[model samples]
Target: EEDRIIVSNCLYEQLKDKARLIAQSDHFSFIAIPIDENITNTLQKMRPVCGNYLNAEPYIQQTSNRFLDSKKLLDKLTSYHSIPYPINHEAQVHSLFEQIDPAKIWQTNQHLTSYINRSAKSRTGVEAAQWFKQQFDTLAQDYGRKDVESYFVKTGNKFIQPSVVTVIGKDKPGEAIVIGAHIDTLDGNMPGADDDSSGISVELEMARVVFSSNFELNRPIYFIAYAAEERGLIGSGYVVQDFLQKKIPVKAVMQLDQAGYRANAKDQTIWLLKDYVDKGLTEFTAELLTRYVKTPVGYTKCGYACSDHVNWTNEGFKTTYPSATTLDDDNPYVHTSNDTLDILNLEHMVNFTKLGLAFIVELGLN
Candidate 1:
């Protein structure tokens, strides 16, 4: 069980020639393969055409299919009985967006990219995580909010830097709402400004504004800077497993991996990934964007394990991902040294932060 990885049935068929099958299910299949750079590189190559294959070592024996494991997940996807409709918090969300500052988002990205590199296994990544925690702690102090707490979650390997997580309204008595971004880059020299630094900056700006605001929360909201996301979904996988072990009910998960680039100013639309995501949640996200963000909303399809959202999905939690733009207009220099802040649009990224704050307030409120 420790040596096996799980994949969607379609992904398994594509790798059947090389991967040894160990377990099977109606929608998912387990394959015996060592999770390393070789497999990740292979999957990366396939991503251009076939999509992603997940590393499922966290769920060694259990069927990693939500429909099979979670009745709530299935019910939410099939029917929206408990899911809240969008636009309920429009006045509050508008007030929250008023506090958004684009300059802060840009500065955070500059500070994050200045760190040489943030590879999951590198010392630089550890430093970045530490800096993030400090920022959260400072925010707590400045806001005089004792309920805000930040900490690190180990990735089960000393070489990998732990994920930094900040919980707002930690003692709130309800399910949690999560917003995450990967802090690690694909290569040591790559700045990853657009790949993920953009996403992290958006998260930071949202947190700062929310902490300073007078708005209160009904449920806890987690702001996470995930490590090792570039190497499969390793960091997020560990976090999801910990939540499952603790019986933490997650109401919603949102991933903002690439949020600063916009190739077509004429079409400044946020793309909501339609596949491998919760239908009810995606619809709610679309409504949120339309009502509060006031931007054109579009829908697109992403492959299996496309981003950190996949980890939440595997555990039967409703999640949504809003991309910077459509796949056709995505940043071309991601995962390379050319992915610098020079290519990002600060205003474009601000909209993502607006949506991020809206998500937190709308979902965190009772």
Candidate 2:
């Protein structure tokens, strides 16, 4: 059955390397290798100047906590550097709090627009779209298995492309469950391992397991990796628009983004985007999570739309982003080339994959 599927470490290792090579070659910096140690040291020394006015005791405590958390994340990331598909999941979580706030994201966007216009402007909008599509196709062809059916969508002549890869369940067709993540990184040269590579890897691992499992699923499972997320959710927007236009019966959409990070930090807190579909399935899924995953999970309303789930919700589908911590422990290194696997916890990725796998088995496949 599809629900009883399990992915092997060998398969995951193979794909992870392929994906990592692509990301590295494309200049998608995922790790924070110091560009200049002297400059970094100088910056570190100056960090406290900006915080002088804040409460010194609490601020120092929080700073210390962040340092320890960052060290732990970095240790994991460094260990995984040899793995081609190592994603800095911790960095991504840290970025959410440190880099993105809905209120300030617009300003960040403005700077990104300038950079995109100046640097990525060599190609016309149409050319950019084609290039993005080509990149997705290349990666899919390079790593996608025969059992995996992949497609890329360019919405309304937009330059960004979102890619979807579907792995048919072991059982014959029924309702379809979609596990999705965005592929686009933040504007500042973020490698985006945690922002999505973490989710993407989980999705891929899930596919491998579902295809290999004996547990038959009543429905097909689609693992979609969306693109151009940082550009105003363009990729997912196209997907949801297409689904709505076709009136497809989607059983559920599970979105995983920034799932790996420390939860105990002062600023760190887990958040849930409350949707109608979530309300419909939350109780049941929560029960499943409790029984199978052994974690205390909670739900909190999101202040604004973030991640690909928003596109699904706007199109009337239920979606959720199950995370380890809230926006507070978000890393300060995101949107920079410093977002690498050396700064993330692979165990978190492993655990999240297990939870998602359990959810798939208990819900659609069971």
- Pairs of colliding residues, candidate 1: none
Model 2, residue 38: C-alpha shift (Å): 30
Instruction: Judging by lDDT against the true structure, name the best candidate.
Output: 1
TM-score of each: 0.86, 0.57
The digit string of per-residue lDDT tens for model 2 on 254-282 reads 88776555544332233444542366455
lDDT of each: 0.78, 0.46
- Output the number of the TM-score-best candidate: 1
Clash count for each candidate, listed in order shown = 0, 24
lDDT of 1 by residue, 1-366 (tens): 234455667666767777777656666665666556765576666676665555654554345543344333322222222225545777788888889988888889998888778988888888888888899999899889999778788876524688888888889888999889988886568789888899999998988888977778899888999888876677888888878987877888989989988877556788999876788888888887888788899877765568888778766788889998676766778877889979888878988998888888878774
Task: Name the lDDT value of residue 236 in candidate 2.
Answer: 70
Where does model 1 exceed 4 Å of error? 1-3, 7-20, 23-29, 35-40, 61-86
